[PDB]
């Protein structure tokens, strides 16, 4: 499914709101400030992930490998570069109950690969 992003008008740079064209029976995205309209390409207007199945690997950034206060391990080598050392840490993010899961990051500079066991 995936989320749906906001899209803005091409004239007033205000957000385009959803609207339906009965004549063609087709979804349109129209600005309620100017008189711009656009043919939608997703057909989905709203998405709620109640389960919150978020891949926290996307929230991690490689720069965290520079943190002296994070633990490092030599037991989980990097699959992308083969570096031995890697920092690991827990989710520590709200809305995540099973947050004892460990996320690893490669400490090699300019690799910054992130993964999970």
């Amino acid at each position: 499914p995936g989320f749906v992003g906001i899209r803005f008008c091409q004239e007033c740079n205000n957000m385009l709101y959803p609207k339906e064209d009965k004549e063609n029976r087709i979804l349109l995205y129209a600005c309620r400030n100017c008189d711009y309209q656009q043919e939608a390409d997703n057909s989905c207007i709203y998405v709620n992930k109640i389960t919150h199945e978020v891949d926290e690997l996307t929230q991690i950034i490689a720069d965290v490998s520079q943190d002296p206060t994070l633990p490092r391990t030599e037991d989980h080598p990097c699959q992308k570069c083969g570096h031995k050392e890697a920092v690991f840490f827990q989710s520590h993010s709200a809305r995540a109950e099973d947050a004892m899961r460990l996320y690893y990051v490669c400490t090699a500079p300019h690799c910054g690969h992130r993964w999970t066991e």
Partner: protein, 1131 residues
Amino acid sequence: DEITPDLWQEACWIVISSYFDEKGLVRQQLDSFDEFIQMSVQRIVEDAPPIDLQAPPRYLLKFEQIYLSKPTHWERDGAPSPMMPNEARLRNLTYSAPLYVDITKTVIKEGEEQLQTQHQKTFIGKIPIMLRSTYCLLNGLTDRDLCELNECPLDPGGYFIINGSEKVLIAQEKMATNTVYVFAKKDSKYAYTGECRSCLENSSRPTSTIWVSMLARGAIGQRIVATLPYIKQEVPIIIVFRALGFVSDRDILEHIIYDFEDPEMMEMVKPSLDEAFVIQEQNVALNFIGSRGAKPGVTKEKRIKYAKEVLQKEMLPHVGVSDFCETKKAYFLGYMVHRLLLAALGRRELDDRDHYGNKRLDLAGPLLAFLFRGMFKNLLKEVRIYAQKFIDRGKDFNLELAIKTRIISDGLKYSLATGNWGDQKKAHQARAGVSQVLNRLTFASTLSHLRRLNSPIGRDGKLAKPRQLHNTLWGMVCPAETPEGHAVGLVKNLALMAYISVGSQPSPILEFLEEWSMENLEEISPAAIADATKIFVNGCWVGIHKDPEQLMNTLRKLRRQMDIIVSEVSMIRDIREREIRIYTDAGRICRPLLIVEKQKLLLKKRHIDQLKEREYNNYSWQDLVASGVVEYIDTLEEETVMLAMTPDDLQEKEVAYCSTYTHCEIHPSMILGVCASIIPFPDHNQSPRNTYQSAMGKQAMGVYITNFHVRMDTLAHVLYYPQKPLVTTRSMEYLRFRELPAGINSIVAIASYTGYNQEDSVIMNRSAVDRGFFRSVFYRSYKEQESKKGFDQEEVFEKPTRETCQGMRHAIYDKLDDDGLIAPGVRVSGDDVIIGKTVTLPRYTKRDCSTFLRTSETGIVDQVMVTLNQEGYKFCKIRVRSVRIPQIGDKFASRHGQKGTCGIQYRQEDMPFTCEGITPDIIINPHAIPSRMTIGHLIECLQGKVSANKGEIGDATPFNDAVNVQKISNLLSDYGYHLRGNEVLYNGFTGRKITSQIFIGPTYYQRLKHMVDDKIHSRARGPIQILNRQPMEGRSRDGGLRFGEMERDCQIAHGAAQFLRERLFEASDPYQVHVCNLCGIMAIANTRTHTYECRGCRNKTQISLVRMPYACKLLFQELMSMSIAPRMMSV
């Protein structure tokens, strides 16, 4: 090169000693005051606007320079003389220096007829001076020079003398400013709230708090609002953004959402956009803001102007208050919204209110600056009125007469004298407890009071969260020293190496960031903020950077080289969120730490070598800091630091814990404060015991100060024979406990002997007490002055006479001299007269107003001092001396929370004795140990036995693996004693051996201020209060004890109705009234003529006598005052 472990315990303590040679214990007070005088006063004077006044001629009156001379005093003749602090203490003067300001008045009328007149050094006020500060006459003086001036060289200073009273400013905690803090209140309409107490760099107004909240779920989604200052209605964030000139939704989300690939943030901001679509231009948004405000202008023009002024001045002043700053303010408000969304999306943690990285300590300097801003503003106002009333007449005026200097002088003096921190008129809005009377009971109490912090949460509050010992207090606040009463956790104490930052300007840092590859916030495009790292300086988002790591490396190198970045500047890199926050402001508590290389200290052996010869090569602490070997780390930068508790942690281990440390503790024992640093083996006690000792070291007797012979303190206790502890910690070398100790090493036996030490009591040796054991002298000072306020009535010191004086007690006045003052060396008993003062009447033409002794004292007059007070009438101080020999009921304590009163005193033949005839000085009960778990008491006793038998001083420093109980026992077994400190004792009464071998040895005991003779009190028909005819309150008033509500309830449960009536009616306030039997209202009785009548009912026969408490009669009359008719109906 490397310091090996075997040398480490020396090296670290050498380093610590260097610190205390450089800084001292009251460095925060002195540095705060020095910054206030050097910078804050000048900034406050210059930041005031020039007062332009005109009817025509006009005058600006610009203040340009300040001059603070040394403290001086002006006599009645007016001769300025340098005033010494001891003279201020004795004469009840205020140790203040005059502040002169240069004023420039230029006349501008017309025709370019301009001429400037400059009044150099216009006396603008008097500022009280902190002792031992740069502007103190005791500055830079040697110990010989201080002793020449009758000053103690060990006196730390750090306090003011206001009217002879030593006042100490307590550091006040407050939430840090210019920082966004996202909290979540459980019981509120908002789910999340992001607040920012914003305040411009050079303070001129209070903190303007701005909130950016999210409405709790349950229209369609979660709406973001903004509670702007001076506006009593929530305002949507989009409206605020449009009012700042950002009308397009794309621009607003460019400022709020920096990563457009994230639909979660987008959908969570979408409700706010959907709620603000009808408003789409800047003027309409400003009109909406003005309309939602509490002063809605009928015309939209003034509404828009008011909204403009609010959004430019009151909204986020720290971002900038000038015009054209709307871009910076928009970026910052978008950052606030971003932080709120990150909290609501769970991507960031809520901020902790208790984190000391989020707090600031308002010290003497920044507090006196708040006072000085208010007082200088009031002064400029008064000058404006005075000059206006003259130029309205079209003539010149004298600014010297316009400047009524009493504003600044009396304001600072009043505020420091009372503690009510604020204007004297706003005596209830003002916050008390600042500026307390310095505690001079013992040197530890003085040091701790000078290192005292205060959390103004309010003692009434019963939420334990602010009282809890937060994790972040480590190294900054003593974990132990805190009052155990109603202010647990609120009143705190600095740790020994804790340094509160004094403040610095961010200008050099900002300039270097400009020269460096940082990009300003107005010059960037928002698309760059995604991957870039934000840079905040003192809360202001100033720009962004691309490689934060090597930026942090550069900045840390710069700070460690004492380059443009000064040592107290905090530089935190948050990595997961890409902020780099730099702080230079004041109030940041920090502590020094040893920097660590790859896995090595930078403190090599050469530094220890140069520190050992500190007194020859002038290699000091500052050279250690300048070498890049030591660093001050604040609470907020500790979050990014990986500490080593000892260099042993830097060793490569079979399983490495960290292997990437960045700093090291100089010594862990520096987490303790002044009073906890006296506890020996505090890591072998239960922590409440350490807290109770930290409180009880402050009531311990000793020698509170070396120059006690010249001080006329109201109360002072000096121990005859203070001793340094046989078992000491390495921190007391800097507390000067060895030079001014507060106890005696007592041979204490923990035993059950006769039962007179049960339940926290002690048996003392009467023979030891006869030899001066724990004997003290109590000095009490009485002050008096003869006031010639007016010719109506004048007081005068003179030996009263029975024929002229009226209110002359039956006590004899023969001890007085013709001058009316008793002489030193005269033995004075209770109720005796020490000063004969008589006041002229309007037993004729003069009444007796003599000063008696505080009753039941029985001392000897130590000395009498006569001088003139500020206004200049005769002023007397009499110090009376009373020897306090310890007795049954006097409170004693060890350094482990083991307090108790003397149960009984036995002579040396009555006490139990060892085979070599050693009797204990004190016997304490074994039952005081097990529940309390004060094993430090036992280890100290054993170590003290070893120390006394070996001829050394035991090392009881808290965390010392080179000293454990087995080593001490092995040492003690070498001196012919049982290795565990037990001995066979013999019964003193019968001489038989005691079956159980007793644990006996030297322990450091303290005699506490709480002697029974100052507490014993009795009453039998004494004086009564005026309003309700009940016994007075207090020993000093000869008052009665309160039979309270709980006593009433207890006696009701007992069923003792006559005893209850005796206590609550007959022993307190018996009274009689006459009541009308018809209306039940108190009648008029005339018992001499026997005529009783009620004016109400116009009867004089149906009156009844009623025996009621006087308080009940007073209650009924105060109800009749309220138009209530309490009718006592006797039928």
